[PDB]
Amino acid sequence: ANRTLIVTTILEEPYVMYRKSDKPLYGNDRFEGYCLDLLKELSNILGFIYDVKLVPDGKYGAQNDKGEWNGMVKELIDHRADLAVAPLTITYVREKVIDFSKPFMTLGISILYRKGTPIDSADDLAKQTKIEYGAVRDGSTMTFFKKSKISTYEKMWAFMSSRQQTALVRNSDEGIQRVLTTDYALLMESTSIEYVTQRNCNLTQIGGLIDSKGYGVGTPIGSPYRDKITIAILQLQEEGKLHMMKEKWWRGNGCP
């Protein structure tokens, strides 16, 4: 039989979440979400079973000072996993080191905060000094700021980096808790903002999207699966299945 593919992923609502049960769940049955439905579809089309493994360091992946990678990206580079199926942002810097599928969902960076301020844009946010801000550490949002040559965003990076110990959070939940309980705004992908702001009516998006990109399935460079995964994603896109999956996991219940 075809070797069971190792899938690296990360907990992130509503892409990958622990299933709630009153009885024991083992292996892949512990997980549900958009990316799990995507895996069920892709695996049917390509003819494999898989083993879902949460990335040990709990990171999406960025480079350090020395150019060493971490997170899911490192798992692919080091051939620890066959596929990364997660909301993994397709970027120039990553595409040089792994082979991404074509995108299955689009997004852009925006701002998550509480309601009631006159802050209306990243320009406003960088200018004012009342509210701090940051991003999840070692993801594409952090890296976007780190690499930007746009003045406002260069300033924002310098700020995040200066108070990194503090401004950069471990994961979305730490970020969201910081937004709810302190004067802090989170730079966050629009897909995730849409999800949270329809569930917690104290939260809102600030401004529009500051970039435009997509999520893809990651594979190691040279992977014999990447092109087949791309073909399967296009099939699912054309058949309307990706749209249906988004509606399934983003639906309910609502805020004004």
Ligand X SMILES: CN[C@H]1[C@H]2O[C@@](C[C@H](N)C(=O)O)(C(=O)O)C[C@H]2OC[C@H]1O
Min dist. Cβ of residue 218 to ligand X (A):
9
Cβ distance to ligand X smaller for residue 28 or 171:
171
Annotated binding residues, as ranges?
Answer: 87, 89, 94, 140-141, 189
Nearest to 249 by CA among 3, 12, 7, 8: 12
> Residue 243: which H helix or E strand, with range?
helix 241-250
List of residues contacting ligand X (CB under 6 A): 12, 60, 87-89, 136, 139-142, 172, 188-189, 192
CA distance 217 to 79: 15
Cβ distance to ligand X smaller for residue 28 or 205:
205
Cβ distance to ligand X smaller for residue 42 or 218:
218
Cβ distance to ligand X smaller for residue 208 or 239:
208
Min dist. Cβ of residue 141 to ligand X (A):
3
Min dist. Cβ of residue 256 to ligand X (A):
23
Min dist. Cβ of residue 230 to ligand X (A):
18
Min dist. Cβ of residue 12 to ligand X (A):
5
Cβ distance to ligand X smaller for residue 140 or 219:
140
3-state percent breakdown (helix, strand, coil) of the chain, nearest 5: 40, 20, 40
Give the HSE-up count for residue 63: Cα atoms under 13 Å, Cβ half-sphere.
14
Centroid of chain to Cα 102? 16
CB within 8 Å of 197: residues ≥ 6 apart: 112, 203, 204, 205, 255
Annotated binding residues for L-glutamate, as ranges?
Answer: 87, 89, 94, 140-141, 189
> How far is residue 96 from each of residues 59, 71, 215, measured CA to CA in Å?
19, 16, 16
